[PDB]
Structures are given as structure tokens and as C-alpha cells.
Design a protein around this nucleic acid. Structure first.
Ligand SMILES: [Ca+2]
Length: 298
DNA sequence: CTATCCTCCATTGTCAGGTGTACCCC
DNA sequence: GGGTACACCTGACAATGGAGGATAGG
């Protein structure tokens, strides 16, 4: 992959799920103020999905660079402030993020506006720029909080509607899951219950977004993780899966290697619709599918 | 001295893959 | 007497989200 098309909204949504907007503040005395301020737009994915990055680079007029990142990952990064301001900002202005990522990108925009007028090289301009980063991402880490302990983080912005179905496709490609389970049953003639599940995981920040999905897809529910601020919107109900989840993502296809999961998922869902899952032969047919899907892919 | 390229982490939070059992269907 | 769905449980390793450098230009 390298070409494709990518739906503007698919892209936005995918980014709402997987993207980072980074405003980095480096110590270097060779710089007038004592600091280098760099601004980055990053996406990072498994070797599985290098071709997505490629198609993403393409989508953004061919800008940026695709590079080995971690042991098993690759990264697509726009690091040039000009390039960012020229390609990235106008896009995301028109086609707004709807996660709390919007909030990140919005701050990100101001730094790239300060850096634009060159006020960042200036002193107090930096101070403003750090007040921004303060409320971005994880926030300040050690050195930043130490060199700048006097910094009042700037106010975080607010609102939350799904702009387009394709947004959800894209978004789900990032932070969504098509689970297949085999639960050891003690009341079935083949010994195991076959369960399909559809999941979307997300941080409790976006509780309001997630809550809405139930309304949006006309099914599902939200469970909080016992151990943190992790929401799972979930659909376990077979009839809903077959009549709402599948037809949706059939129409608004999944972008990435997860698409291939959705397919094998559907392939099971047929085998379940025909009651063949209570046979040993069709149960087997399932094991193979699931075995070679998700964490066991390629 | 400022801007972009570039090659490298570490930590922990998603994904993903399971249960315990209320309850509907025969 | 066979089969389903919600609520709940739980861990590994990729996704966060960085970290320096080396440049080449003004
Ligand atoms: Ca994420």
C-alpha cells in the first residue's frame, strides 16, 4: 500500500484515536532563551500497518517521513513547523476532531502560531508556549516543572458530536476491537461457548462521547474498568452484532490491518448464524479463524 | 543560534482473551 | 437439557510520547 483514497472523516476519526500532537521543549544553552521549542504531528503503528502510514503520507500531499520507531513499530511524522502550518492546520480546522484530542490539537495550534510569528525565540513568548504544553498530553515532566515551577497551565477548552459515519469507521480502526472468545461451558454439546464481541476502548475523559455511541449505533453498553479510567463500549448481543455492527462497518469499511480482523469476524458470524458453531467441525472452523486473527495475525 | 533531519528509549495503558451465572429455549 | 448474554477479571508489549544528536543556513 501507498496509494488509496482515505475518507477525510475516516482520517480525522482515525487520528482522534491514534494520533499524537507533540509540543516539545528541549534544553540547549546554544539557544538564546536556553530552550529549543519543536512541534510534531505523530502517528505510530505496528509493522503490520506500514502501508497505512504510506497512504496517510499520501493523503497529506506526500509530506512528512515514515521511519522505524520502536522494535516492532514505525512512525509517520511531520516535524517542520512551516509544513505543519501549511498542510496540517488548515485540514484539521475545516474537519474538526471531536475527542479530547481536539483540545490537544487546539493548544498545538497556538504554539505553531507563536512559533509562526517567531515570538517563541523571544523570552515571555516561550513562557506562554510552556503554559500551553503544560495542559497538553501527559503534561510537564520533571525538568520542565523544575526549570518552570511558576507556570500556570493554560485553560483547557468543551464540546462532543459525531460529525460523520466515516469518522466512526476511522476512529474505530484505531481504538476498536472485534473480539472472538471461546468460553469453557459446562452445558453445551461441544464444550465451548462461541462469543463474538465488539469493543471500543477509550479514556473516561470522553465518557460523554462514548455514552452517545449507544444512541448512535442503536445498541451496546459502557462498562468502566475496575482499575482505572478506562471505558469499554461493548456489544455482546449476537442479534445486534449481525444486524447493526456488521452492516455498518461493511458500509463504512475499516482502514488498516484491523479490516482483516473484521472480515474473519464476519466469517465466524456466518458460521454462528447457521448454528454450525454447536458442531465440532464448525467449532474447529472457528478456532482457525480466531487463531489467525488479531494478536495472532500474519 | 535557529530549523529540520535522524536514530534511538521506558513506562503503562490499550487491546485482546478470558470468567461466573442469571435466565430464556426447549 | 442446550444455549445465550451482561458484568466482571486480567496481563503483555505495542502505543504513548518521549529522549538526543547531527546537520546545514542564516
Ligand atoms: Ca490511543
Amino acid at each position: 500500500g501507498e496509494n488509496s483514497k482515505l475518507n477525510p472523516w475516516a482520517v480525522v476519526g482515525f487520528i482522534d484515536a491514534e494520533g499524537s500532537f507533540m509540543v516539545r521543549v528541549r534544553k540547549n544553552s546554544k539557544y538564546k532563551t536556553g530552550w529549543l521549542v519543536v512541534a510534531i504531528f505523530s502517528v505510530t503503528v505496528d509493522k503490520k500497518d506500514l502501508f497505512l502510514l504510506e497512504s496517510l503520507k499520501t493523503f497529506f500531499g506526500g509530506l512528512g517521513s515514515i521511519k522505524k520507531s520502536g522494535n516492532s513499530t514505525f512512525s509517520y511524522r511531520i516535524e517542520s513547523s512551516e509544513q505543519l502550518t501549511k498542510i496540517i492546520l488548515p485540514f484539521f480546522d475545516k474537519y474538526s476532531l471531536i475527542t479530547e484530542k481536539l483540545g490537544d490539537y487546539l493548544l498545538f495550534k497556538k504554539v505553531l502560531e507563536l512559533m509562526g510569528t517567531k515570538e517563541h525565540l523571544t523570552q515571555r513568548g516561550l513562557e506562554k508556549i510552556v503554559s500551553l504544553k503544560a495542559s497538553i498530553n501527559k503534561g510537564l515532566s520533571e525538568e520542565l516543572q523544575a526549570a518552570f515551577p511558576q507556570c500556570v497551565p493554560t485553560p483547557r477548552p468543551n464540546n462532543k458530536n459525531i460529525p460523520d459515519p466515516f469518522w466512526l469507521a476511522g476512529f474505530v480502526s484505531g481504538d476498536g476491537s472485534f473480539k472472538s472468545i471461546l468460553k469453557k461451558s459446562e452445558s453445551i454439546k461441544v464444550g465451548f461457548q462461541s462469543i463474538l464481541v465488539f469493543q471500543i476502548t477509550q479514556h473516561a475523559r470522553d465518557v460523554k462521547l462514548m455514552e452517545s455511541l449507544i444512541s448512535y449505533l442503536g445498541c451496546g453498553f459502557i462498562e468502566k474498568d475496575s482499575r482505572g479510567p478506562w471505558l469499554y463500549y461493548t456489544v455482546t448481543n449476537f442479534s445486534d452484532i449481525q444486524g447493526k455492527i456488521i452492516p455498518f462497518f461493511h458500509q463504512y469499511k475499516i482502514i488498516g490491518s484491523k479490516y482483516g480482523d473484521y472480515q474473519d469476524w464476519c466469517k465466524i458470524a456466518l458460521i454462528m448464524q447457521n448454528k454450525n458453531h454447536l458442531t465440532p467441525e464448525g467449532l474447529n472452523e472457528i478456532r482457525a479463524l480466531k487463531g489467525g486473527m488479531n494478536k495472532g495475525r500474519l
